Structure 1
C-alpha cells in the first residue's frame, strides 16, 4: 500500500480534493496509527483502518484564506471534517481519503492552522537548566539521545513531552556541551510506514563532523567570542547609505587554497582571513581602500558535498597536471576522478542553515567553527569590508527518513519541502524545494537570518533563488533584521542589506504558490535583485544559448566573430537594442526612467522589453538593482570575452574589453557587483559550471603570475558539448595573459572604484534624482554604434533647481567606447563648459586613457578605442 497524495488537509475542518460532483457524495477519511491500511481484495473499500468518517461536501467551496495561501488548489472541491474528529490524533497517522479512488493527504495547511508556534525552539539555557524544544506535530514520539563526545556511545535517552505540537524536555545545566540527536517516530509518506528517525536539531548552532550529532552549545558563552567581539559594532566600516554599496563575490576555499603566504594548516577555511599580511588579505585591503564595501561569501553554513573529516580528502598531483597540454582533457579526468572526495564544493546543498560549515574550521568537533567564523567577520570588518552571506533557503540537499544529510524532512515529513499536486517533492531548485509559504518554514528562515545577524554580526544577505521564496517571507525578514539595534542586540540592523536572485520559473511562476520573490514582485521593496538584462546585453546572448552570440562589449556588428547573426543592418540594430537595455541598467534599471530608444521613440524602462515581453527596467529605486556582468555561475568575465570576441584579437585588446565591462558596472547607478577575479583576469579555462571542478579549475592566484587560462579542457559533464570551441582557444598561446596584464587589470580596476567613490553623482539615492540628473547623449537611429555617453548633472549657477550633492564637481560625463578606434562625440548641449579629464585618469598607469580630451567650442569628447573616459567639471 503506497498511495500518492492528491488531497489536502487545509484547515482543521476542511479537506480539498479535485473530484467530480457525483464522486463527492461518497468521500470518507480513514486513519491508521500503525500505518496498517490496504485496499480490500475486490477493491470496493479500504481495509485495516482504526477509524473511518464520512466527509460531507462543503457546497461553498474553499474559503478566501485557503485560496490565498494555496492558489494552485483554489478550484478544488471542499469537504467538511466533522467536529467529532480528533485532528491532533489523526495527523500522527497514516491517512487516506477514498471514494475506486484512493489517495493520501497533504497536511501543511492543517498543521499551520492548528500548530503554528511562536514560542522557543531549539536549546534554551538558564542559570540552572537547559531545555530542548522541537516542533513535530505529526510525530508519535520524540526522545533525545545524549552522547559524551562526538564519537562515543549513547549515554542516556530522555523522553520529550508534547504540548501544542511542540516536544520539550528540561534538564540540568550539566547538559551543556553534550552531543545529541532526536529519536523521532513519525509516519513517512515515501515509505508508507511509521519510522524511527535519528535527526539533528533544525535550530542547531553547532555540530560534530558532518552534522552527525548536534553540539548542545550555549552560543552566548564568553569563550566563543574573539577578543573585543562585543565592541565590533563600533569598529564596523561606516555605511551612510545602501547607495554606497559595492559587492565582491568570493568563495572561502578559492580565497586561500593556493595562497602560499598562509600557513599550510590554515589554507582553505575561515582561519585564512585572520592572516592580515597574507597576499589574499592584502589584495582585499587594496580593493577596500579603493572603495569596495562588501564581500559576499559563497555558502558557509552546514552543506553537503564536502567531508568535514580532512583525513578523507583527496588531491590531484598538481605537478603532473601542470605538464599536460593546455587543451588536453587529462586534467579534468584527474579532477573528476576525485571530485566527490576532494575539499571542494560551492556549497549550494543545504543541510542545517544555522551552523558554520565544519570543513572550513580547523577542527569540526567543538567550538572552532564558531570562533573562527567570528574571527573571519571581525578580520574583514577591520580591513574596511562588510560581510554578506549567500543564503540558500530555497531547497534542501536531501529528504526522507534516512541519511546523515536529511534533517528537516526526517522530523516533519512533507512539510518543509514543497510538493506537486500528486504529493511528489518539487525539484526545480536542484532538488527538495522548500515551502517558505508554510508558517514554520517561514519562521525558520527568519530565525536563521537573525541568528547570523546577531550571533555572527553578519552585515547582509544574498538570497539564492529568491523567486522560490515567498515575498511575505522576504519582507518579514527585512523588517525583523533592520529593526535590530546595538543597544538590544549588539548590531545596527538599519545597515543590514538584502538582495537576491529573483528568477521566476517552474512551479512558482505566475504567483501559483503565492506572491513569490521574483524580480517584478520585489519592485518597490528596497530589496536588491540581479539585473540579468544588463549582463546579457554587455556580454551577448545568454548563458544557455549559443556561446558565440555577441553583445555590446564582445563585438556585435563592430567586430563580427564569424558566427552568423544576421545581415549588417540586423546586427547594427541588435547592437543598438542592447545599448538601450544597458543604458536603462546604467540609470538604475528603473521602471519609469525615460530613454530616447534606438528608434528615436522615447520609452520608459518598463516599455523596453526582453524577449519574453517583460520589462527591462523593473525597479522603483536604484538600491533594488544589482548590476553585474559576471558571478560564480557560468563563464568568468575573462572567459566569456575570450569566447565571444574575434579569435584574432590580441590578449592586450581583450584586457581592455574586460576593463570596459567592469567599469560599466563600477560607474552605474544602483549597486555594482563584481565576481572575485574580474579585477585580475580570472579564468576557469572556460568552465561553464565550476561548482565541483576542484581547486584546479577555480584557482585564485594572488601572486598574479597566472590567471588559470589554459589548464586543460574543463570537466566533461557540464562542458563537453562546447569543447570544440574551447580547445583551439585554450591551446593558443596568444590568449593567455602574463603577470603584466594581470597587474594592469588590477590597477585600472582600483582606479575605476576610486572614480565611483570620488563623486556622489555616481551613487544617486532615489529614482527622482536619477530621472532629474542622468542623461544619455548618443541615442536614436543615427547613434554612433559602439558608444554610450552618460551625463550626470549637479547643482550649478545661482539658485539652481536641485540640491548640490558634490562639493568638487558640478557635472560628470562618462563615455564608454567599445569601438576598436578613437571616437569623437559632439554634444553641443555640453559645449562651453569646464570639462577636464578626471584626475585619476590624468594620472593613470594606462597611457591610452590619458589621451582623452574635451573641446569647449563644440562640446566634443575625444575618446580612444576600447576605453572608458570620465570627464568632470570642477567647482
Structure 2
C-alpha cells in the first residue's frame, strides 16, 4: 500500500523488537494486544496534535500485519518529525475487564517521549488537564556525545546518598540559575554537592507524569510525582527544551545531566514506581495499557474489581509474563542508553506478589532482574513494604544482591536520641549495621540504607520542633500522614522558643547527623537537612508546589555552621577506614564502654552508649552519646603512652563543635581542656555526643 500520498510504502514488518524502531530507510512499529480485534496506526504532526486531529491513519491487516498477539507494520520514509499512536477495537465490558474503544488513540508503552504539554502547571487548550498525547518516532542515529563517559562503579560501601527533588532543588529564586527547576538548572549546583561529600544522588520520580491530575477536582498538584504515565520517557516539563523537537531535546537534556554528574564523581540512581499507573481505577483516564490490553497489565479480581494494594486505585501486574519483559526492558534501556547507575523501587513488596496476590518466595520478576547480565552490575534498592500490610524489611527475596531501606533504624534512632528508655541495646545494634537482619541471610552491613528523615514525614528540623503533625493545608482535615512521629519539641512547641530550647535543638540535630555518619551501612539524608529545612510541621506535603518543598538557598547561608558540620562529618567518614567496613565489625576491633571504660549499661534505664574502635589510619577513635537529661563526666579508655585528643563535641559553639587544622587557635582550645584530658576524663552536657582520636603522647 502507501501511507502518505504514495511517498511511503507500507509493508508487513516484524513483531520484534517492540515499540518503534528506525532501520532499512524506514520505521518498524510493533505492539502487543491479545484482546484486540482490529488495530490501526495513527500519525499526527506537531500542529495537528494540538488540534486533536489525526493527520494520517494506516489500517492493519489481521493476516499480514499480525503475528500471534503482536501487531506490526513497516512504513518506509522519514517520519522522525511526526508523532504516532494506536487505535484498537474489540470487546467492552468493565464488569468483565475489557476496555476497548475505537474513539480513543492510545500511546505506545515503548514510546521514548510523550508529547502533550510544554509548561509546568499550565492547563491545556481551554482549561483542559488531559489533552491528547502522542509518542516520538525515532531517528536512524543518535545525536549525543558522551565524551568517553564510563560507569564509575563505586563499591556500595563507599557511598553517601542524597535524595533530591529535581524541580525543588533549584526552583526557588535564591538559586540564581539560568533555568530554575530543570535538568540544566541542577547542573550548575552539582559542585555544591561535591563539596558536601555526596557521591551519589537519588532522583525522585523523573518519569512522565501529570502534575494536573487533581487540579480539576480540588486545585491541587501532584508535586512529588508518584503516578507514572510512561516508563521509557523522562518528564518533559522538567526540561528547558519542552516539547520542542518532538521531545528529543528533553532526552538530551537528561543525558547531559547524567554525563556532568559523572565528571564530578557523582552517581545517579533513579526512583521508579512500577506498582501503579496514572490511569487510576475504573473511573479514570485511558492513556495507555488499559486501552491496549487491560487484562494483561492490571491485576483484577474475578468480578472485574481492581486489586488496590497501593491506595492509588490499581495495582500493576508485575509478575505477568509480558509485564516482566516490559519492566526488564525499561531497566535495561535506562542503563544502557541513559547511563544510569541504579534504581530505587517504591513500595517494593508488590513485585513479590502473585500475578492473580499471594506473596512469592522466589518471584519470577526479581529472578529475571537479579539474573540479568546487565542489571546485575547496578545498584538495586528496595523499599520493602506496601499499603496492604506487608513489611518485608529484613526478609526480602534479595538473591544476595538487593539492598534495602531500614525503617527499624529510623524508629530506634529517633526514640533513643529523643530520650526513650529501653533503646540502648537497639541503638548499639543499629550502630553496627543490624547484623541480626543482614548477617544471618548472607548479606553485608552495607546492604542497609540508613536514614532518619525522608521526603515523607518530618524533616530534621521539624523532628526536634513539633510533637504532632500540622497537615491542615492539605485539605484532609489532618486525616493524613503519620500519626506516630516519635518527635520531641525539646520542651516548647513551635519555632518561637527560648534560647535554651534552641541550643538544645541544635545539639539534637548534630546528634542525629553524627549517629548517621558513624554507623555501619550506607547513610542517606533528604535535601535541605544539612541546613535545617522546615516544612512548618506538615509531614505530608505531596501537593504543594510552594516554597515549603523548595531548597532555600538563602536560608542555607544563615545556617552555614550546620552545613560545615555536616560536610566535615562526611569527610571524616570518608577518611576513617573503620567506618566503611565491607564485613560486620568484630569484637576484636570494636569495644563497648559505659560511664566507665569497659562497663556498658544495657539495662532498661540506660541512656548512654559509647564505643571505641581501632583504625589503620587514625590509630583508634572513641565515640559517645549521652541522651540523658543530666550532664556527666565520663572516663576514657586507658592507653599507656598515648592521649585522647578532642575532635567533635556537639555541645560546643561553632566553629569549635568540630576542630580542624584551619582554626587559628586549635591548640589553645585543646590546652584549656587538657586538665581533664590528662586524667582520661571528659565532661558532657545532657543530650550530646563526642568523638575523640588517640594520638601518641609525645
Report the Cα offset of residue 460 of structure 1: 1.7
Report the Cα offset of residue 504 of structure 1: 5.1
CA distance in 2, matches of 1:624, 1:118: 40
In the alignment, what sits opposite 1:360?
238
CA distance in 2, matches of 1:691, 1:764: 36
Note closer, same or farther for the CA distance 1:866–1:468 as it changes in structure 2 (3 Å cut): same
In the alignment, what sits opposite 2:561?
744
CA distance in 1, matches of 2:140, 2:682: 60
CA distance in 2, matches of 1:619, 1:862: 41
CA distance in 1, matches of 2:68, 2:134: 24
CA distance in 2, matches of 1:849, 1:666: 14
Q: 1:634 aligns with which of 446, 457, 461?
A: 457
Per-residue displacement from partner, 1:363-384 (whole Å, max 9, x unpaired)? 1342222111112222333333
Report the Cα offset of residue 844 of structure 1: 9.3
Structure 2 residue 118 is matched with structure 1 residue 297: no
Report the Cα offset of residue 202 of structure 1: 0.7
The SS at the match of 1:534 is helix
Report the Cα offset of residue 698 of structure 1: 1.4
Structure 2 residue 549 is matched with structure 1 residue 698: yes
In the alignment, what sits opposite 1:244?
158
In the alignment, what sits opposite 2:624?
815
The SS at the match of 2:268 is strand
The SS at the match of 1:347 is coil
Indicate the RMSD between aligned Cα atoms, in angstroms. Answer: 3.4
CA distance in 1, matches of 2:302, 2:621: 56
Structure 2 residue 382 is matched with structure 1 residue 503: no
CA distance in 2, matches of 1:672, 1:349: 27
The SS at the match of 1:154 is coil
Contact between 2:41 and 2:57, CA under 8 Å: does it hold in 1?
yes
In the alignment, what sits opposite 1:203?
110
Contact between 1:467 and 1:519, CA under 8 Å: does it hold in 2?
no
Structure 2 residue 366 is matched with structure 1 residue 474: yes
Q: Which moved more, 1:497-506 or 1:131-140?
A: 497-506
In the alignment, what sits opposite 1:55?
none
The equivalences for 1:329-728 within 5 A come to 338-340=219-221, 345-362=223-240, 363-365=242-244, 366=246, 367-399=248-280, 406-420=287-301, 422-431=303-312, 432-470=314-352, 471-480=363-372, 483=374, 494=377, 496-503=378-385, 506=388, 509=390, 519-522=394-397, 525-539=400-414, 551-556=415-420, 575=421, 577-591=422-436, 620-643=443-466, 644=488, 645-647=490-492, 650-704=501-555
Note closer, same or farther for the CA distance 1:427–1:763 as it changes in structure 2 (3 Å cut): same
Contact between 2:206 and 2:235, CA under 8 Å: does it hold in 1?
yes
Contact between 1:811 and 1:873, CA under 8 Å: does it hold in 2?
yes
CA distance in 1, matches of 2:695, 2:336: 44
Report the Cα offset of residue 412 of structure 1: 1.1
Contact between 2:170 and 2:550, CA under 8 Å: does it hold in 1?
no
Note closer, same or farther for the CA distance 1:185–1:653 as it changes in structure 2 (3 Å cut): same
Note closer, same or farther for the CA distance 1:849–1:179 as it changes in structure 2 (3 Å cut): closer
Query: Number of matched residues?
Result: 601
Q: In proportion to residue count, which structure has more helix?
A: 1
The SS at the match of 2:535 is coil
Note closer, same or farther for the CA distance 1:866–1:524 as it changes in structure 2 (3 Å cut): farther
Q: Which moved more, 1:152-161 or 1:770-779?
A: 770-779
Q: Which moved more, 1:362-371 or 1:163-172?
A: 362-371
Q: Which has the larger radius of gyration?
A: 1
Structure 2 residue 71 is matched with structure 1 residue 177: no
TM-score when scaled to structure 1?
0.63
Report the Cα offset of residue 119 of structure 1: 4.5
CA distance in 2, matches of 1:793, 1:691: 45
Report the Cα offset of residue 499 of structure 1: 0.7
Contact between 2:385 and 2:393, CA under 8 Å: does it hold in 1?
yes
Q: 2:28 aligns with which of 131, 139, 149?
A: 131
CA distance in 1, matches of 2:587, 2:20: 52
Per-residue displacement from partner, 1:630-687 (whole Å, max 9, x unpaired)? 0001111111211123216522321221121122112211110101111010111111
Report the Cα offset of residue 810 of structure 1: 2.9
Note closer, same or farther for the CA distance 1:699–1:401 as it changes in structure 2 (3 Å cut): closer
Contact between 1:833 and 1:856, CA under 8 Å: does it hold in 2?
no
Contact between 1:186 and 1:195, CA under 8 Å: does it hold in 2?
yes
Report the Cα offset of residue 755 of structure 1: 1.0
Note closer, same or farther for the CA distance 1:642–1:208 as it changes in structure 2 (3 Å cut): same
CA distance in 1, matches of 2:411, 2:86: 48
Contact between 2:204 and 2:270, CA under 8 Å: does it hold in 1?
yes
Per-residue displacement from partner, 1:74-101 (whole Å, max 9, x unpaired)? xxxxxxxxxxxxxxxxxxxxxxxxxxxx
Q: 2:589 aligns with which of 773, 782, 785?
A: 773
CA distance in 1, matches of 2:336, 2:349: 26
Q: Which moved more, 1:816-825 or 1:388-397?
A: 816-825
Note closer, same or farther for the CA distance 1:654–1:638 as it changes in structure 2 (3 Å cut): same
Report the Cα offset of residue 527 of structure 1: 1.6
Note closer, same or farther for the CA distance 1:189–1:869 as it changes in structure 2 (3 Å cut): farther
Report the Cα offset of residue 860 of structure 1: 4.5
In the alignment, what sits opposite 2:645?
836
In the alignment, what sits opposite 1:159?
59
CA distance in 2, matches of 1:843, 1:385: 33
The equivalences for 1:790-805 within 5 A come to 790-794=611-615
Report the Cα offset of residue 758 of structure 1: 1.1
TM-score when scaled to structure 2?
0.78
In the alignment, what sits opposite 1:103?
none
Contact between 1:680 and 1:746, CA under 8 Å: does it hold in 2?
yes
Report the Cα offset of residue 198 of structure 1: 2.0
Q: 2:169 aligns with which of 255, 259, 277?
A: 255
Note closer, same or farther for the CA distance 1:376–1:642 as it changes in structure 2 (3 Å cut): same
CA distance in 1, matches of 2:586, 2:289: 46
Report the Cα offset of residue 824 of structure 1: 3.3
CA distance in 2, matches of 1:518, 1:537: 14
In the alignment, what sits opposite 2:126?
none
Note closer, same or farther for the CA distance 1:585–1:415 as it changes in structure 2 (3 Å cut): farther
In the alignment, what sits opposite 2:132?
212
Note closer, same or farther for the CA distance 1:183–1:638 as it changes in structure 2 (3 Å cut): same
In the alignment, what sits opposite 1:547?
none
Report the Cα offset of residue 821 of structure 1: 5.2
CA distance in 1, matches of 2:83, 2:285: 15
Contact between 2:30 and 2:72, CA under 8 Å: does it hold in 1?
yes
Structure 2 residue 37 is matched with structure 1 residue 140: yes
Report the Cα offset of residue 207 of structure 1: 1.5
Per-residue displacement from partner, 1:320-375 (whole Å, max 9, x unpaired)? xxxxxxxxxxxxxxxx97434xxx61000111111011211221342222111112
Note closer, same or farther for the CA distance 1:141–1:290 as it changes in structure 2 (3 Å cut): same
In the alignment, what sits opposite 2:607?
786
